DNA sequence: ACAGGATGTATATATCTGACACGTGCCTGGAGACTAGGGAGTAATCCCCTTGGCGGTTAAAACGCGGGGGACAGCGCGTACGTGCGTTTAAGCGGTGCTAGAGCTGTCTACGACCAATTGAGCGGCCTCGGCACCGGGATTCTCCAG
DNA sequence: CTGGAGAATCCCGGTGCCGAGGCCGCTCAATTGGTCGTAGACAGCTCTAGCACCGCTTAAACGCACGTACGCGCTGTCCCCCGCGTTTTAACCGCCAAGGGGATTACTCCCTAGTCTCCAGGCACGTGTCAGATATATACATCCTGT
């Protein structure tokens, strides 16, 4: 019979904002393996969404104290460099228009006699 | 048209600014020539990789994709360009 | 016809509005975010492919992704990502 | 006149075998300890840098330090 | 009576203002000319997208800033506040570039 | 309990050694070093060529992807000599 | 029923390294859904050339060490004494290869 | 197994420095070298144990170790 | 009379030459194996190690410490010192990227 | 004055292809310890007299340490 | 700078000894031959968008100068480390013994590929208004000389 | 040890602007629902090697004595780089303009996956034998004391 469900995205089934279907397609066309399991895109999309949420929360926190309601690459760079764990995750990665983390060596400060 | 000695275009105040962003207080006078040398070596490596990527694609224009692949090649992954 | 390209822009924006209801984002920051998502996806998928090849498995399952996450992500971030992935897989299995 | 011509001819002959066959521009100052033939140092250094580890004339394989500079004078 | 700052204080002010800021510290046209010169040294008759040149400038500035950070740390290690070419060479060789 | 079958580049490395050093042997540990080196370089060239085919939206890896991968990964004059050797082998294979 | 007996693609290209095994590993390694005919030939040629270079350098080091058998120390000396071959394998360590013998000039005796 | 980091004795660290071309060694070098060695082992062994756990194995094979080293940009030849 | 005594440094140089000419392991095998098992039991209890796995770990650690001591010696020479101090290792590791 | 350099040119080249000691025949031997070049029969006869030292730089060498060369 | 005494190192012969090189039997993984269908090479087009020039102008670079503060050589010291020696520890080697788990094999079933229909998510284009850059001025804070 | 003067910086507020985000239309790829094949989980068996203990030997670790050389602090001196004002210059923005080739489409052909059979290349195993440590025995290159 033609009685079938209309549509139900795998992202909504897993309760994810990130696309399970697009991640599955990219896994299939990326030549990673001959086969891709059903739960592999779900797990990968969940991990990607968690990492995105973490970095975006940190970036919004960095933007809030700068009196800006709009995340810029400087805020993302500050969020990544302040968080030493995300910093070590993205140690060998440079961010365009992000600047650097403001720090000066303690010996370079004035003697202040 | 050909281009010559544009490595001098990376001028002394520009290198001083780059060192200031790197938290450098005092800069020797011989820092600048070595900075030209090392920046030129890095640019030769990256541009050679990007030109090889462009040549493989049968293209005569170096896109941002080629530069991004050359950077992710050398452990220098760059974000914000694709 | 017309060029078509896909990105994680709407997904990143939905996550942002979930975590920060009254905060915006710029085009350059969204490019940073898309590059980050593709880079992490490539790292995890390549590591899972390497585990599948080492263990002679012809398929990538949630076990491969979990092992790749444990290998690549550092420490507490890896633990939280593993918990989130397991939660999503268990939720997807029920529905 | 004949003596000068003969002397110039033998001087040219000396120039023939005192110059590296690979270069033929400037004088030999090195030897490969595998083929026992005299060449100049920077020609064989270039060939090693060019990853051509064969003698220019007998094609004998030589190592990184199978050639050393010769003190002719 | 002229007013002068003691040496180092203005340098510290530049350090602060260039660590707070994010814009490119190299003039765009000279760097573009340098990139094009190196490219034509590699392959002649070559064209560059503007995004490609901007990405190259971002990468080169980031690399030079990191190298200068390591060079400054080398300078402090030798009980110095000025950087020297030996500092750059040591940092590059430790990083594996030599 | 039967016997398994493990593939290796040992005989190929030995053939190359005999054709370059006819009267020089190789130890088992050095053979393991050589096999690991061959596997590493093979996987490196293959991964770079796979990424090259992915970047150009190409579904096949031909001699040109390996061409580009060798020009990239191998440094200096190793690159051009391996290019010459690979092109020579490809021409000799297409001729015969 | 008449057919050619056999001729390995390695023999066709004049290569000692296996073109067929390289081709099989290229398909099985999940690199692309298709692999050209000349790609394994060119890759086998490159692998054989690199093998010949490293093996010739190792044999040269072995002869300089008065040994007719290549040991991992000879391979390590071959890698570290060739700058191109060193930076091709810069992030690679060799088991039981030792290190290249060098001493910094300031550490030498002052001759006083 | 408790306190086996002292099993990396002082003369062993001096021998390691001698191979590294070190002429003089401070007395405080040994503890800090033991610490950084402990950090290095923690990283490599953690990756190797993750590789072993994925394979549903209870034995850490040499291939797991070389995969762990290759992950950290420290490729090792001679063990597969 | 007058028992022989090498000056401080020449014995060290002789050990440098000997241990750079040689290739064997510079750490005793049993203590390093015990250290590996100690560190491994913090990740998964009741764990077994292949012998070749322990040799591979030992080779990797020998190579890492030798390279780290090379960079440490270069840092010490940079500071116009011939002795290596902990700050040398800290600087070398931080430039290399661990710190 | 061109000829004045000519026999001056002769004595310069003629000196450096001949043996430092015998000074009468072209050099066709080397010493690999001292990186110096002598002729063949001089090093043969001076090896036969049981003095294994270089006449000019005083370098000790063995039997296999010196060999024939083709200078030409 | 030069004896020489001693220490260490580099060459020249017997001698075992496992490891290495070669010979055999399989057997399964490459080779031959042939099909078919899709990937890509080639021809054509078109429309971004890259390159090139000209002009204003103005921010930035280059130049020169005063000086001060950091680099470096030298000195002194004292202590921490190197070298050697006697002592103690445990590493190493071999041998045995037990079994846990690596590794392989046969079932089979339950997931993953494949495919037809489709439809709702996601991307391209439009447009608007508000977050933010900027101008401008005052207040605050940092620096430095001169008391 | 601060006062105060000069200069850099923060903050407050109005204004315009351009791009962030919401909306609309379309379209194509993710979804649903089946079939079918085969990958792997799963129980069972084998047997390799990992682990544990034991004992002897001796290499190595360790503790200490003693000297010395070098790590470090202090002093001088000196000269090189920083701050700053002025002049030049070419970077940058705007605008114009041409055409190069990146990107897309359409067509065809040839190249590679897939199959089936077949055989020989390579792997596991076995076995002779020979570089090769491993000693001594002898002849130079440094190390250090001494003059
Ligand atoms: Zn020459
Ligand atoms: Zn020759
Ligand atoms: Zn003579
Ligand atoms: Zn001599």
Residue numbers in the entry:
A (entry chain G): 8 to 120
B (entry chain B): 20 to 101
C (entry chain H): 30 to 124
D (entry chain L): 929 to 1001
E (entry chain A): 37 to 134
F (entry chain D): 29 to 124
G (entry chain C): 9 to 120
H (entry chain F): 22 to 101
Question: What is the paper's account of this structure, in its own sentences?
Answer:
Ubiquitination of lysine residues is a major histone modification that regulates various genomic processes such as transcription, replication, and DNA repair.
Thus, we created two atomic models of the RINGA-RINGB complex bound to the nucleosome based on the obtained density. R955A in Model I and R981B in Model II also form salt bridges with H2AE61 and H2AE64 at the position of the so-called variant arginine type 123. Meanwhile, the results of our mutational experiments also showed that when Bre1A-type mutations (G974TB and A978TB) were introduced, RINGB could function as the catalytic E3 enzyme.
